[model samples]
Target: DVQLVESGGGVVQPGGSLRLSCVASGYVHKINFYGWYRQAPGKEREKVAHISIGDQTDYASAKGRFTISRDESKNTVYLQMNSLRPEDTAAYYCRALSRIWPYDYWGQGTLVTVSS
Candidate 1:
């Protein structure tokens, strides 16, 4: 089993990047799937990707810059995006993924806000 981790901070600036992670302690190198999601200031959480290890990245049709990847050596998974516009800014998040598509599990979110 693994515990999820997320940022507990304030807003972020436009054009800035947001990142969150889940470390595999007891079950490193065993994880093959990862999930990333996003939520507005006060809205529902939505699935972003269903990334499989060492394969082509699959982005949603609406996604512009979001990405997801995995590293078995580090026992960690990552989610990143660039070109942050006003609408692109929000609470960025990450998770270790317990199952297949759809987020039956989740992280607290990195809390990224884009503004000066």
Candidate 2:
């Protein structure tokens, strides 16, 4: 079975930047894609971004401030953002994407709190 481990969540002030990571094991990376999602407090899950095996990246509605990258050698995917705001506070999740259906596997999630 495949498993994902997430890290790099902590408190950050408004206007600060943060980066989160997801490492995958027991899976092949050459043919798979990875993505990131977030759930704001008391709100529904929102798509953040995703990256393809060939290094093509796609994002959601608000795309300028977010970036998705991967380290094929580490089997890790990353989500980075800047010019943060309080609204960015949320539990972020990473997942593996499949051609037929997305969200095949998911990380436990990392909670990022944006405050003063």
For each candidate in the order shown, give its overall lDDT on alpha carbons: 0.59, 0.83
Q: Against the true structure, whose TM-score is highest?
A: 2
lDDT of 2 by residue, 1-116 (tens): 43789999899998888889999886534346788999987899999998776658998933978788888788888888888888888999998865553338889999989899
Pairs that clash in candidate 2: none
| Candidate 1 residue-wise lDDT, 1-113, digit = tens | 22555543345576666555555455333445677777787777777765765576765622756666666676666766655567655565666544444334445566656
Clashing pairs in 1: 12-113
Separate clash counts for every candidate: 1, 0
Whole-structure CA lDDT of model 2? 0.83
Model 1 gets an lDDT of: 0.59
